[PDB]
Design an enzyme around this catalytic site. Structure first.
Site, PDB file in Angstrom:
ATOM      1  CG  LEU A  44      -2.006  -1.098   1.201  1.00  0.00           C
ATOM      2  CD1 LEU A  44      -2.891  -1.008   2.436  1.00  0.00           C
ATOM      3  CD2 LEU A  44      -2.850  -0.999  -0.060  1.00  0.00           C
ATOM      4  NE  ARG A  46       9.631   2.355  -0.489  1.00  0.00           N
ATOM      5  CZ  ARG A  46       8.790   2.375  -1.517  1.00  0.00           C
ATOM      6  NH1 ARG A  46       7.715   1.608  -1.509  1.00  0.00           N
ATOM      7  NH2 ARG A  46       9.025   3.166  -2.550  1.00  0.00           N
ATOM      8  CG  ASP A 155       3.511  12.688  11.570  1.00  0.00           C
ATOM      9  OD1 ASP A 155       3.823  13.750  10.974  1.00  0.00           O
ATOM     10  OD2 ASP A 155       3.719  11.545  11.120  1.00  0.00           O
TER      11      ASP A 155
HETATM   12 BR1  LIG Z   1      -3.842   1.712   8.897  1.00  0.00          BR
HETATM   13  C1  LIG Z   1      -2.959   2.335   7.356  1.00  0.00           C
HETATM   14  C2  LIG Z   1      -3.559   2.270   6.103  1.00  0.00           C
HETATM   15  C3  LIG Z   1      -2.868   2.728   4.973  1.00  0.00           C
HETATM   16  C4  LIG Z   1      -1.581   3.263   5.119  1.00  0.00           C
HETATM   17 BR2  LIG Z   1      -0.580   3.901   3.603  1.00  0.00          BR
HETATM   18  C5  LIG Z   1      -1.009   3.324   6.386  1.00  0.00           C
HETATM   19  N1  LIG Z   1       0.190   3.781   6.841  1.00  0.00           N
HETATM   20  N2  LIG Z   1       0.242   3.604   8.162  1.00  0.00           N
HETATM   21  N3  LIG Z   1      -0.886   3.041   8.569  1.00  0.00           N
HETATM   22  C6  LIG Z   1      -1.692   2.855   7.489  1.00  0.00           C
END
Ligand SMILES: Brc1ccc(Br)c2[nH]nnc12
Ligand SMILES: Brc1ccc(Br)c2[nH]nnc12
Ligand SMILES: [Cl-]
Ligand code: NA
EC number: 2.7.11.1
Length: 333
Positions: A44, A46, A155
């Site tokens: 998804l 990084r 953040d």
């Molecule tokens: Br839960 C979640 C979903 C999509 C992303 Br991209 C994310 N990054 N940290 N946590 C996330």
């Protein structure tokens, strides 16, 4: 003499009144699960601290999000876990489902209940006036909740707001920089992304609180109602304060520095100059005027203050006339 001490105006002592084990995350004992309960489907995203995957829980065939933590202090990992456990079930807070290690690599990972990887940054430059008010109110629910639970996110930025626009649902994610608020504690100022950093971070005032999140929220609001991404566009952390000073003015900045007896980095001595406080009308034009109202500007003005104690709290923000129609429609529904 040193900087003048500061206390949060709200939720000042909530962690003091809790059992030690609520906030003493260094002492938290984690029961690590087996990442082999999950199969990774696709990548998804990084970040600096993690890679994030869509995954399947092979036991119940449920879709989840797996956040593989890049090697980092055990201390930071316990902090994020404890905060997520403390906030689990809160309004518009991401739900931690499991905590696991890969049996081979022993790399730690957090498993969250599924959210689509559609962040606010992808949507927030194309919203109607009503939808900006609606989603701002949903973010405020998450912030009032975490602040009420003794936690500051630190953040807040569009990437860390996941939105399902079809279902009008929002989750505040990435609690990896979040901390517990303790009165008199001095915090790390190397938090938040440049464009969302509060003046306290930029002048190295360490005794900050929940109000840091309300500055970040103001930066997001300004970006959205003015269609200006980012609103404060600094080259680096020094120039970031200059970009703020050219909008909020230098008079209020030096009054803030004097009030808290802040020792200003000498680098600032030639670059801040002398600037009037600009009227918000200066940022209004034919493309954004449909998003800008007296209500929006009055609200924004009360988020973007140098003095962290001056800023609206999350609950005060939710009480602002800007949200009257959202509050009315919520009750109706
Ligand atoms: Br839960 C979640 C979903 C999509 C992303 Br991209 C994310 N990054 N940290 N946590 C996330
Ligand atoms: Br993106 C996103 C945000 C909030 C909820 Br609730 C979601 N459910 N699926 N995807 C979601
Ligand atoms: Cl962002
Ligand atoms: Na207008």
């Amino acid at each position: 003499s040193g900087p003048v001490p500061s206390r949060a105006r709200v939720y000042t002592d909530v962690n003091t009144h809790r059992p030690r084990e609520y906030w003493d995350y260094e002492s938290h004992v984690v029961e690590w699960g087996n990442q082999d309960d999950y199969q990774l489907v696709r990548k998804l995203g990084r970040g600096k601290y993690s890679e994030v995957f869509e995954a399947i829980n092979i036991t119940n065939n449920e879709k989840v999000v797996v956040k593989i933590l890049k090697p980092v202090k055990k201390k930071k990992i316990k902090r994020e876990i404890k905060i997520l456990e403390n906030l689990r079930g809160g309004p518009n807070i991401i739900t931690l489902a499991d905590i696991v290690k890969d049996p081979v690599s022993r790399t730690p990972a957090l498993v969250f209940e599924h959210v689509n990887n559609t962040d606010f940054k992808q949507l927030y430059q194309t919203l109607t006036d009503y939808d900006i008010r609606f989603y701002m109110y949903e973010i405020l629910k998450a912030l009032d909740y975490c602040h009420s639970m003794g936690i500051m996110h630190r953040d807040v930025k569009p990437h860390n707001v996941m939105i399902d626009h079809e279902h009008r649902k929002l989750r505040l994610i990435d609690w990896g920089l979040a901390e517990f608020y303790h009165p008199g504690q001095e915090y790390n100022v190397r938090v938040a992304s440049r464009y969302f950093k509060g003046p306290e971070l930029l002048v190295d005032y360490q005794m900050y609180d929940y109000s840091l999140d309300m500055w970040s929220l103001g930066c997001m609001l300004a970006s959205m109602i003015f269609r200006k991404e980012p609103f404060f566009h600094g080259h680096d952390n020094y120039d970031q304060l200059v970009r703020i000073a050219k909008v909020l003015g230098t008079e209020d900045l030096y009054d803030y520095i004097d009030k808290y007896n802040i020792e200003l980095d000498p680098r600032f001595n030639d670059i801040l100059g002398r600037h009037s406080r600009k009227r918000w009308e200066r940022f209004v034009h034919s493309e954004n005027q449909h998003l800008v109202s007296p209500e929006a500007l009055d609200f924004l003005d009360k988020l973007l203050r140098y003095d962290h104690q001056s800023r609206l709290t999350a609950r005060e923000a939710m009480e602002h006339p800007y949200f009257y129609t959202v509050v009315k429609d919520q009750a109706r529904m």
